[PDB]
């Protein structure tokens, strides 16, 4: 049968990695942005 968890958990799943990603936003992002962009 059709079963799914992450699909519904995404709300917290994304927030988890997204929120914890903040540390890589204030400064890291500037480097990654340039790196990814380059």
């Amino acid at each position: 049968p059709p079963i799914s968890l992450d699909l519904t958990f995404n709300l917290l799943r994304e927030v988890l990695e997204i929120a914890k990603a903040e540390q890589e936003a204030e400064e890291a992002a500037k480097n990654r942005l340039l790196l990814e962009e380059a």
Binding site: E17, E27, A28, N31, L34, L35, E37, A38
Partner: protein, 84 residues
């Protein structure tokens, strides 16, 4: 300052036309001269500004197959290396 370092980075090229200029594109990276139509592969050095950053992946600047530079350097390879 950077140019000579980027230009001399390779040395003794002698490319009879069709090549890219050895200098900087985006970040402070010294790219060497190569013949037109070449996948100029070379990631970032160990540590960037204030962080180690990933250096296992190998990005490529790509040498325009005519006489210039490309648009993608695929520097994404140099990403963060933290545990969440």
């Amino acid at each position: 300052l950077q140019d000579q370092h980027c230009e001399s980075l390779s040395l003794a090229s002698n490319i009879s036309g069709l090549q890219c200029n050895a200098s900087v594109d985006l970040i402070g990276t010294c790219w060497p001269r190569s013949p037109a139509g070449q996948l100029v592969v070379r990631p970032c050095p160990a540590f960037f500004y204030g962080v180690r950053y990933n250096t296992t992946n190998n990005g490529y600047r790509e040498c325009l197959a005519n006489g210039s530079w490309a648009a993608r350097v695929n520097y994404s390879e140099c990403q963060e290396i933290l545990n969440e």
